[PDB]
Design a protein around this nucleic acid. Structure first.
Ligand SMILES: C[C@@H]1C[C@@H]([C@H](O)CC2CC(=O)NC(=O)C2)C(=O)[C@@H](C)C1
Ligand SMILES: [Zn+2]
Lengths: 103, 58, 159, 218, 51
RNA sequence: AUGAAA
RNA sequence: AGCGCCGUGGCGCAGUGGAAGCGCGCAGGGCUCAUAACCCUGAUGUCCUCGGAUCGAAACCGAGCGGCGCUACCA
RNA sequence: GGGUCGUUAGCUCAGUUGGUAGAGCAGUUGACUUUUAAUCAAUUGGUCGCAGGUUCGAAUCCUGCACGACCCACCA
RNA sequence: AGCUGGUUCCUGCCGAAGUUUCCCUCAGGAUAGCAGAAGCUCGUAUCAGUUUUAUGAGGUAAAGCGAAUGAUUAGAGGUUCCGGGGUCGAAAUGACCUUGACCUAUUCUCAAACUUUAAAUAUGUAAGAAGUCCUUGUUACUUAAUUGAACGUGGACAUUUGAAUGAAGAGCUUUUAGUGGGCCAUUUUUGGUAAGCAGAACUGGCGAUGCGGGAUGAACCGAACGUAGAGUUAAGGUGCCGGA
RNA sequence: GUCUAAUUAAAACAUAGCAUUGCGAUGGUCAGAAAGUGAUGUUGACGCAAUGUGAUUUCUGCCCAGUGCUCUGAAUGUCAAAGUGAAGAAAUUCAACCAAGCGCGGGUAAACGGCGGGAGUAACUAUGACUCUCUUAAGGUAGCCAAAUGCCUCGUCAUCUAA
RNA sequence: GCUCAUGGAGAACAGAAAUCUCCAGUAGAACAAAAGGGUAAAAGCCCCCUUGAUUUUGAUUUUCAGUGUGAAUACAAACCAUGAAAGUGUGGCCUAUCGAUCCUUUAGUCCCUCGGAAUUUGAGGCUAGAGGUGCCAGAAAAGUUACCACAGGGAUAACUGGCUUGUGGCAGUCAAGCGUUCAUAGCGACAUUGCUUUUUGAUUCUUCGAUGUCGGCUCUUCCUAUCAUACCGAAGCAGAAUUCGGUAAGCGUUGGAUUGUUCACCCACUAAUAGGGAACGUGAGCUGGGUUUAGACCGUCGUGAGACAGGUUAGUUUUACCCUAC
RNA sequence: GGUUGCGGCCAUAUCUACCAGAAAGCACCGUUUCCCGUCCGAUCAACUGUAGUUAAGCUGGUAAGAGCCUGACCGAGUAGUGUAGUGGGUGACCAUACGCGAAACUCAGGUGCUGCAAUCU
């Protein structure tokens, strides 16, 4: 699959509230902070004797993730997310699909 | 040790005991699902006609 | 696996027709629909938008709502032990009127005409329908119409 | 080395024909459907005799085959290969399934039984009813008792109560004798290699006169 | 349960394992690709594609 | 490296 | 009986949708008195058969045929 | 005791799934040689174990019929 | 302990389910259904396991295949710039003969996953008062438009207020038990050689149900139960056992 | 010689003998809650500890790729805490560094254990010393057998038998 | 804006198949795929412009508890595209292509809180999405036990019994042929109708708070589909010997070798050495070879504990005095 | 009645082969500067309505026409099917009673009708 690098879409930014041009980029899940309450509770919960205390997941089936975008309005920078289907191969650098060509 | 997978036996006796009551139909039904444009105009029109009838008999 | 889809066991049902494939004629669109109108439901498989479910194929309902290219319809549906009201946002290609209701309205205005004539003369309308009552005596003649005696036929193989 | 026809006799189950779904069958042993002088003509063989059924059953290609051979053997023995035309009138398209178990003592440990009941093909069969003719023949009255002897033998090979009938018809037509004869001393007929083409009162007079000329030259 | 023996391929090293026949075992998405050959510098294979 | 029988 | 694998040159064994690799064997030439080995050369593969999909298959999915393998326990 | 496979030139082996038996070995003759051997060429041989349908018509379609080659055959 | 076993007096009234969905769920539960009890609003109807009239929808039976798709038998008559070839001959889109193709109309047989057609039975809806007609009020909706739409004012339209029949009261809620192993018969029907086999569809029954007949029997036929009496019958029978 | 007392006394265990492994006392093996504790040990490699095999005779083949055991460290691999540095107002973050071990590379089979298929060919035919090829860490060597191991199998030949 | 597949007729190279042109062409093509519907100035092919695959949240349908998830339908308020315009457009022509809580993370609000008052980091919140549970309404998870235990189970197996009888076995119909000649003395292929329950399956009704489980020995009784014996008929019966068939189950049907054996195979006698049933007769009648616990050996399988209707060896066989029958 | 435009139902309207066509109207047709699109003024855009022709299109008629449609006192009350039966039969199956009721075939007929507006001897 392929997508362009810029897209005309609504920007609910409180002065646009209309279609502006949006630079697209991917969404990366973001590095995890320590000192978040789950991690703190987890370090305490695993602290000491008792062994593993929370489950841990292995029964994996999905060979794909949903791909997700960030849409930065060029004027307001009101970012925005919107999600797409599942794709094995993904690409933003789009060499267009020229129909009238050979093999 | 297999089992009986499915059957509709006796369900209609069970239903027709105290069964298939028609839904109570009512005057002045729900104006949900109705075109909201029409809902809105209908509101304002009823306000107008209530005012008019009260002014005809005040 | 067991397969139960929106358009399952529907092949011959949304088969359009013989010698009627392609587009739709225009009275389907020029017809009119109002609240309280009773309507029939047959589905045009050539119009894959606004369709009903095969349950509602060949059924009947009442209008409650009207929009650009579509109409609201109420139906009653047996679910276990009760009839449930079900609301459909259908397309007029799948809608049509109920001529039963049309003829009922015509009977109504004719009944009113009879009541008017009987207000004019006091002449005992008897408005109500009545069944095919049993028939009355008569005398059938025989002239040019003598009874031909008939009797059974023997067994012939007919091969 | 086959299973009994009593096991595969009645129409217990719907028609399972050859198709793009089965795709894989054991071909018949019968392949012939016409015997004798099939290139004979209509007035050549006026008499037509039948063999019908009073059951509603399935008939195997093997019985069809053996009965074909018995009747044709009798006829081609006594009255020669070119004194008659025999025609079978039921084609076996149906197919017969078998859940092949084992024929050992010790299959207990691996049989698994009725899990996997859907059987594979192991033959064919026909499907007949009351009056649906099984065999027909066209010949002359001199050859009559010869051919009905043949049909007697074929009865003895097929199961059930099958009947023989001497038709009121001229050859394999759906036409009766005197109507054929008035037509044929008239000119509405035009012989094919075996069968005949008739004159319609409908359509192109030009084609009719291109054909059937004597009828116009009444 | 299944005894499995497979050769690690970038090394040439045998790998023997065993695990029940019904448990899930991982597979990669390996694919081979042809490539042309150009003037070889130090060990980097000097290759190219049609485009 | 081998080289048929008299 | 159920399930799984495999059918590539004369032989053996590789082969990955844009289209067959290697060795040994074969042939020709040269050296040799002659054959070997040796040096220079060339060729050979309905890719088990049918059908299908594909713009196009040895490959990819059915049909069949064959050579094998695995199953076969508690009684 | 059955289920399968096959029984082709004097020998062996393809055979063609339907109309013609082909290859090899062997033998006879020829070439070769001082004569032989091997090597080259050529003919010889074929109902393919007994009857059926019969493709017009049949070894090979397959029905049975005598030879063999395999796989199977209480039970707790 | 989701498993086995046992679970103490009488009578009266009503009276089941073994099915749906989810559960490491399949010997169990939750949920909905089935059933009881408490009643509540009203007082003969906003109903009916029903028919008729009218109107629709279905694509199963049956039928057809000289109608589509697919399969299929046999002939004939043709086109060979036309597949194979045999011949005349040097050959010639030259001539002839034969043979598989293709074309033509004809013929025999078929289809759960083919069909023009197309039932029976089952199934939806309407048969009025919350209605019909006339007039004009409203609106930010709609219209080119005091045009339409929706809801209304006022008035008129009665006894036949809009077919039949019946209604034993109609409607409404709350709460809760037990159950969630099901089986037999007719008819349709899938698997299977077939099965007192396995499995679905409709209805009725057994379970939970005795009585009379089938000698005998869970289910069949007849008929369903307070205690008694009198008569008459059912199904089945009337030689004797055995009432006739 | 010993065992399953109260269903198995045997081919099982043991045994002598063979072989291997660890250990030089600041130790090996083992114990113990610990301890100024302990067994071997009132001992010292012809010894203590742990294994296998099982008299004598003869003989012990090929495989260190796998799994284990073990020896390297010469290494930009990985690399915890403590510790160091930078940033920051600090929490804190990032970076570097990096023990053993793992990884890397060697050894080891009287350690666990393993020890292949396919074609063609000889002047009768059959067979195949021979040759070719795929592949393995290497392909079962000496020797032994339908033996307590051999499905097919009541294997084929002989003998014992009238069978 | 065009109209596809295919066929026919032409055009050098060029042929069956290269590109071009004309005629027919109701779809016999194509629409990402599975299959089915649907579609011919289109939904197919080409061309032009675009990003409605957007935002707000609600309603509705399907599965259905009228819960969720998923998918879809029709609208309102916005912002947009395309077009001359009507109009169409909230992903793919329709039918499938997917995922809760806690946690983590990102976007929005730049809003709330950090509870003695403030600022700033940081943390925690609200709205909306993702990271994934495929056992797909979603636990975090390898084996063995013949040393075994327990609660139960005839809802569920292994014997017997029962229905069924494919298969096993037995008997018929018909008669191409064989039989020197001749279908039937005797056999009788291809086809077909039945029977039996002595096999083996299939099923799981009874039986899991136990019906003592192969064989032999012993011993009786029964069926006949009669091996022999009695009487008879037919013959390709000269005689002898033999074969087929009828009434017939009265009477009899062995000894041994090997094997646990049923069975089989041999030896020999024999008048003949027929088949079967009785809970696959019979264990308070035997035995205990075998099978069938625990010990042990081999082989193969397994990393291993351990497995093998694979082989071998060793391994407790209880009570009748009651009723009935006798 | 004819013709044109916009049409409803979408074959009685289609298809094939021929025959005819007053007027008028359509159409064929003539031209390329202009907007416009094409490999090409062939298609499409624009101009004149002049040059000319009703040959073709278009309209209608013919065809023992193919096809379509309708009807049958044709087939057929058949096939199938609902309900009942201590009905028959070994069974497959069938008949009877109360009921519903096809298709194919056979024969006969028909071959577009019609709305709004404008126009033509
Ligand atoms: C699988 C991984 C984690 C998973 C989640 O943490 C799993 C469990 C955590 C737990 O212990 N109890 C729960 O309620 C859910 C989740 O949300 C997924 C998207 C991503
Ligand atoms: Zn913005």
């Amino acid at each position: 699959v392929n997508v362009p690098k810029t897209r005309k879409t609504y920007c609910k930014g409180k002065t646009c509230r209309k279609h502006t041009q949006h630079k697209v980029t991917q969404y990366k899940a973001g590095k995890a902070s320590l000192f978040a309450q789950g991690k703190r509770r987890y370090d305490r919960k695993q602290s000491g004797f008792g062994g593993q205390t929370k489950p841990v997941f292995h029964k994996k089936a999905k060979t794909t993730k949903k791909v997700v975008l960030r849409l930065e309005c060029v004027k307001c920078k009101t970012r925005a997310q919107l999600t797409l289907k599942r794709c094995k191969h993904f690409e933003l650098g789009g060499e267009k699909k020229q129909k009238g060509q050979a093999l | 040790a297999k089992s009986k997978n499915h059957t509709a036996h006796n369900q209609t006796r069970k239903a027709h005991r105290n069964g298939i009551k028609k839904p109570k139909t009512y005057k002045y039904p729900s104006l949900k699902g109705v075109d909201p444009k029409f809902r809105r105009n209908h509101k304002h029109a009823l306000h107008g006609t209530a005012k008019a009838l009260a002014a005809a008999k005040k | 696996g067991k397969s139960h889809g929106y358009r399952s066991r529907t092949r011959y049902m949304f088969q359009r027709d013989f010698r009627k494939h392609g587009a739709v004629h225009l009275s389907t669109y020029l017809k009119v629909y109002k609240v309280g109108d009773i309507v029939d439901i047959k589905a045009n498989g050539s119009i894959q938008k606004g369709m009903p479910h095969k349950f509602y194929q060949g059924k009947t309902g009442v209008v409650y709502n009207v929009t650009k290219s579509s109409v609201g319809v109420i139906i009653n549906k047996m679910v276990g032990n009760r009839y449930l009201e079900k609301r459909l946002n259908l397309r007029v290609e799948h809608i049509k009127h109920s001529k039963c209701r049309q003829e009922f309205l015509e009977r109504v205005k004719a009944n009113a005409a009879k009541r008017a004539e009987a207000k004019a003369q006091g002449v005992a309308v008897q408005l109500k329908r009545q069944p095919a009552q049993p028939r009355e005596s008569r005398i059938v003649s025989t002239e040019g119409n003598v009874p031909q005696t008939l009797a059974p036929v023997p067994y012939e193989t007919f091969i | 080395a086959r299973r009994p026809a009593r096991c595969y006799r009645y129409q217990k189950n719907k028609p399972y024909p050859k198709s793009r779904y089965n795709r894989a069958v054991p071909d018949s042993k019968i392949r012939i459907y016409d015997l004798g002088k099939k290139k004979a003509t209509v007035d050549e063989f006026p008499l037509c005799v039948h063999l019908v059924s009073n059951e509603l059953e399935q008939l195997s290609s093997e019985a069809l085959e053996a009965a074909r051979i018995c009747a044709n053997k009798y006829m081609t023995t006594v009255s020669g290969r070119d004194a008659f035309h025999l025609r079978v009138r039921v084609h076996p398209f149906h197919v017969l399934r078998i859940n092949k178990m084992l024929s050992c003592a010790g299959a207990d440990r691996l049989q698994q039984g009725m899990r996997g009941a859907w059987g594979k093909p192991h033959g064919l069969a026909a499907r007949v009813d009351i009056g649906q003719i099984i065999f027909s023949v066209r010949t002359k009255d001199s050859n009559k008792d010869v051919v009905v002897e043949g049909l007697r033998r074929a009865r003895y090979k097929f199961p059930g109560q099958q009947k023989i009938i001497l038709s009121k018809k001229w050859g394999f037509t759906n036409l009766d004798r005197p109507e054929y004869l008035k037509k044929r001393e008239a000119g509405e007929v035009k012989d094919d290699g075996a069968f005949v083409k008739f004159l319609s009162k409908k359509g192109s007079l030009e084609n009719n006169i291109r054909e059937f000329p004597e009828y116009f030259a009444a | 349960k299944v005894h499995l023996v497979a050769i690690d391929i970038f090394t040439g090293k045998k790998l023997e394992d065993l695990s029940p026949s019904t448990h899930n075992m991982e597979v990669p998405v390996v694919k081979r690709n042809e490539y042309q050959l150009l003037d070889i510098d130090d060990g980097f294979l000097s290759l190219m594609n049609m485009d």
